[PDB]
């Protein structure tokens, strides 16, 4: 008797497929043409990558839990999720610190050296959502039954909670990184960038706090209702940051 | 005298003893001579101010729940502690970014009279200080019951998260700041930077992680030996940013 899915999984089901659709679109635009090979364009690539692993894995997710149920595999994907979405988080922090040096090395007159940082920035960011995503799998998990598990069934509390303190203090980062770019150009670009934070934050803070003030025993409506802002910013993701610039709609244009 | 203090609160008691001494003798120093005016100094003298009333407060608490028992003003100065600390890491932020802004505008070709910015970065972390530690003085009072009181008794479980939450955000902050001054500086006095920050990171992360990862039933001993690294860190502050300076040094041998 496989459980008969719910209205809110077939809306992240839903919402997965739309990510992924969005992103394949995406990481098809950026390798299709062998233009886009700039430091600059990878990292967009290495989010669009991301987003839509995690998407798939949304997708995969419900299949395998609903249609065609196994044990050892939906362990295998939530883990999948975790790493897609650390990926994403990481990639996002890459392109911030490489946009913030790039205003910085042209108003400063400096040559600007990115072959290099930016392969060792990827690096640490997939590195990040490896090692952050294969702790489900072997190290830290609560299938054992005795290991205080969190709201999130296959994850850990203290898996989570990790997780919760990485997210702010990249959020910390993040928002000095906001505050600065702020400052070298001093108007409406800032209240942009400023709607840009805005929308990242309205999305990802809700989970990750409620990955605190949460119980094993909370209601699962919750899970869902704070997990579905960070698909909603996985979705959008992509608009802001790859479907605006000039080159991308260009090709799309042709 | 009813109580009977263990061999646990007494070097609580010393050590709030030391950092009392320590903080009153820099305080005395920045205001006894009319010179320091600057907001440089400003900022040392505030985070003196708050590591001494920090210290006074831990001589307090010892005072008033092992030999004058009061249950009204013990739970004051444990607002008041936890008042100064908010204070002491506002402090520590407002040093450090109006370091990096020092930095910055002696490494380039612009001034301004920064006379008017120290004072709302005073202004905000003497007035986050006090929001942050009039919650114990208010609805967010565990001693009521039904509230699931946090690792300490007084204090409940989700002002401990929102203060976890809130020194994660500033702990990224200050980790992208020690970052740039790495950057913008660059060799051996850069590792003294990283004693610096190694100074505040080794003392404040196991009580703001153990008030993520701890439970109400958790021992008590837990408590004191994370809080501990926390009396040590107010305690070595003044002898890096207030011992170091070479006109209170001046002073101190006259
Ligand atoms: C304690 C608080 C003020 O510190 C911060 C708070 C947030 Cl939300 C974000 C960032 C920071 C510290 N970064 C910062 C602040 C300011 C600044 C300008 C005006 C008034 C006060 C502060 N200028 C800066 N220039 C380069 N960094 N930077
Ligand atoms: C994801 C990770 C790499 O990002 C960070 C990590 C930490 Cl612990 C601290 C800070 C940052 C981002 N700030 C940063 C990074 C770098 C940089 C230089 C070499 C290799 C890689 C990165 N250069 C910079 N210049 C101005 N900020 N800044
Ligand atoms: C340099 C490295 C930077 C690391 C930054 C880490 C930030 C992580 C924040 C947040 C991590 C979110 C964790 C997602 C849990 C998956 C839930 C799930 O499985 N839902 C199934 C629905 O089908
Ligand atoms: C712009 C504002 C910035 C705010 C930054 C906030 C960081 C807070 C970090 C850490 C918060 C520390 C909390 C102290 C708890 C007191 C424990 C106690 O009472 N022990 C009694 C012993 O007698
Ligand atoms: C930033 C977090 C770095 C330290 C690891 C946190 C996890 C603590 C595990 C505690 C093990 C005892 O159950
Ligand atoms: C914009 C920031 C909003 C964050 C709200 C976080 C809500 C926390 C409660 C989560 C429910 C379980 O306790
Ligand atoms: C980072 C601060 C964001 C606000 C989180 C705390 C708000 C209080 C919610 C408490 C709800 C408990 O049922
Ligand atoms: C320098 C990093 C030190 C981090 C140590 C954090 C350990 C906290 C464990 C608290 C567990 C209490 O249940
Ligand atoms: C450990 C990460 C840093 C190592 C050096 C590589 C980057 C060169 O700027
Ligand atoms: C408290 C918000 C501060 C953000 C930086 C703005 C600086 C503009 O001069
Ligand atoms: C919102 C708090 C800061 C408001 C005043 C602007 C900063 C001073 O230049
Ligand atoms: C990679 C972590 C260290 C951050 C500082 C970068 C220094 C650049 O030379």
């Not at 990878?42 to 692993?53: E, F, K, N, Q, R």
């Not at 922090?93 to 007159?109: C, G, H, K, P, Q």
């Not at 299938?143 to 296959?154: A, N, R, S």
């Not at 309205?202 to 003030?213: G, K, N």
């Amino acid at each position: 008797p496989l459980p008969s899915p719910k209205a809110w999984d077939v809306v992240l089901c839903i919402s997965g497929t739309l990510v992924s659709c969005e992103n394949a679109l995406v990481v098809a635009i950026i390798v299709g043409t062998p233009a886009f090979r700039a430091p600059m364009f990878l990292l967009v690539g290495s989010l669009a990558v991301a987003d839509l692993l995690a998407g798939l894995g949304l997708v995969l997710h419900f299949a395998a839990v609903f249609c065609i149920g196994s044990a050892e595999m939906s362990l295998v994907l939530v883990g999948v999720l975790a790493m897609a979405f650390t990926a994403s988080i990481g990639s996002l922090l890459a392109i911030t610190v490489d946009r913030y040096l790039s205003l910085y090395n042209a108003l400063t007159y400096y040559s600007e050296t990115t072959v290099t940082r930016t392969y060792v920035m990827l690096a640490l960011v997939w590195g990040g959502a490896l090692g952050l995503g294969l702790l489900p799998v072997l190290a830290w998990n609560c299938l054992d039954g005795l290991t205080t598990c969190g709201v999130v069934y296959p994850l850990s509390k203290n898996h989570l909670v990790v997780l919760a303190i990485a997210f702010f203090m990249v959020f910390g980062i993040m928002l000095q990184l906001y505050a600065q770019i702020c400052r070298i150009v001093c108007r409406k670009g800032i209240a942009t960038l400023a709607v840009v934070l805005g929308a990242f934050a309205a999305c990802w803070l809700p989970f990750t706090v409620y990955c605190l003030l949460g119980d094993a025993h909370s209601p699962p409506l919750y899970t869902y209702l704070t997990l579905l802002p960070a698909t909603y910013n996985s979705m959008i993701n992509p608009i802001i940051y790859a479907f605006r610039n000039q080159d991308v709609q260009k090709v799309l244009w042709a």
